[PDB]
Design an enzyme around this catalytic site. Structure first.
Site, mmCIF file in Angstrom:
data_model
loop_
_atom_site.group_PDB
_atom_site.id
_atom_site.type_symbol
_atom_site.label_atom_id
_atom_site.label_comp_id
_atom_site.label_asym_id
_atom_site.label_seq_id
_atom_site.Cartn_x
_atom_site.Cartn_y
_atom_site.Cartn_z
ATOM 1 N N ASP A 63 -6.588 8.059 -0.683
ATOM 2 C CA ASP A 63 -6.055 7.045 0.256
ATOM 3 C C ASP A 63 -4.886 7.659 1.028
ATOM 4 O O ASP A 63 -4.043 8.344 0.404
ATOM 5 C CB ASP A 63 -5.608 5.800 -0.505
ATOM 6 N N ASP A 86 -12.617 8.146 -8.291
ATOM 7 C CA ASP A 86 -13.923 8.677 -7.811
ATOM 8 C C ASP A 86 -13.736 10.020 -7.089
ATOM 9 O O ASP A 86 -14.758 10.552 -6.650
ATOM 10 C CB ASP A 86 -14.633 7.658 -6.903
ATOM 11 N N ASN A 89 -9.000 5.046 2.802
ATOM 12 C CA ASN A 89 -9.800 5.796 1.818
ATOM 13 C C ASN A 89 -10.718 6.822 2.515
ATOM 14 O O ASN A 89 -11.529 6.451 3.354
ATOM 15 C CB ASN A 89 -10.649 4.805 1.024
ATOM 16 N N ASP A 148 -15.258 -4.920 9.380
ATOM 17 C CA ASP A 148 -16.418 -4.418 8.597
ATOM 18 C C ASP A 148 -17.170 -5.555 7.899
ATOM 19 O O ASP A 148 -18.208 -5.259 7.272
ATOM 20 C CB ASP A 148 -16.002 -3.494 7.446
ATOM 21 N N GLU A 207 0.861 -1.204 0.000
ATOM 22 C CA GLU A 207 0.000 0.000 0.000
ATOM 23 C C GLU A 207 0.891 1.246 0.000
ATOM 24 O O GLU A 207 0.562 2.186 -0.688
ATOM 25 C CB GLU A 207 -0.889 -0.018 1.235
ATOM 26 N N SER A 245 -11.993 10.379 -4.208
ATOM 27 C CA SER A 245 -11.531 10.060 -2.840
ATOM 28 C C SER A 245 -9.994 9.948 -2.894
ATOM 29 O O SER A 245 -9.398 9.950 -3.984
ATOM 30 C CB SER A 245 -12.172 8.814 -2.302
ATOM 31 N N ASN A 272 -7.938 8.527 -5.871
ATOM 32 C CA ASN A 272 -8.797 7.503 -6.530
ATOM 33 C C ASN A 272 -9.583 8.153 -7.671
ATOM 34 O O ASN A 272 -9.828 9.358 -7.619
ATOM 35 C CB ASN A 272 -9.719 6.821 -5.514
#
Ligand SMILES: [Cl-]
Ligand SMILES: [Cl-]
Ligand code: NA
EC number: 3.2.1.17
Length: 129
Positions: free
Chosen positions: A52, A48, A59, A101, A35, A50, A46
């Site tokens: 990270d 979209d 995110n 989650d 990562e 967003s 990202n």
């Protein structure tokens, strides 16, 4: 801060990630390697809109507030900037919510694609833990 491999394994253990939700310390160190290459200041945008943040590339779509991700949540209740600290406490505490989650470490696509089902114990081999 760019952690050393064993240095980050030790910090992750001290912060209770060692077998957190059944994920051995190597899984966590492997995820951090792919990562962020162990760099707490890592950021990536990202498609979209967003972003990270930090050693586990958490995110802004769901987990942190950066003020520029329209329609996003802040489920870890932190500014995304906290995820860039030399102190990994906020990244670790938020990662515990993420991995809890429902999809476990599959939340990290790089973990699924590069760590899952590999010899992850290699990541902590030789480390004083
Ligand atoms: Cl390494
Ligand atoms: Cl929220
Ligand atoms: Na957000």
């Amino acid at each position: 801060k760019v952690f050393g491999r064993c240095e980050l394994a030790a910090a992750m253990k001290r912060h209770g990630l060692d077998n957190y939700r059944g994920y051995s310390l190597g899984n966590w160190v492997c995820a951090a390697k792919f990562e962020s290459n162990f760099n707490t200041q890592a950021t990536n945008r990202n498609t979209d809109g967003s972003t990270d943040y930090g050693i586990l590339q958490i995110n802004s779509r769901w987990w942190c507030n950066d003020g520029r991700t329209p329609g996003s949540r802040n489920l870890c209740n932190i500014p995304c900037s906290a995820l860039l600290s030399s102190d990994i406490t906020a990244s670790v505490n938020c990662a515990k919510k993420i991995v809890s989650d429902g999809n476990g470490m599959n939340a990290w696509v790089a973990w699924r694609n590069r760590c899952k089902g590999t010899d992850v114990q290699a990541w902590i081999r030789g480390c004083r833990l």
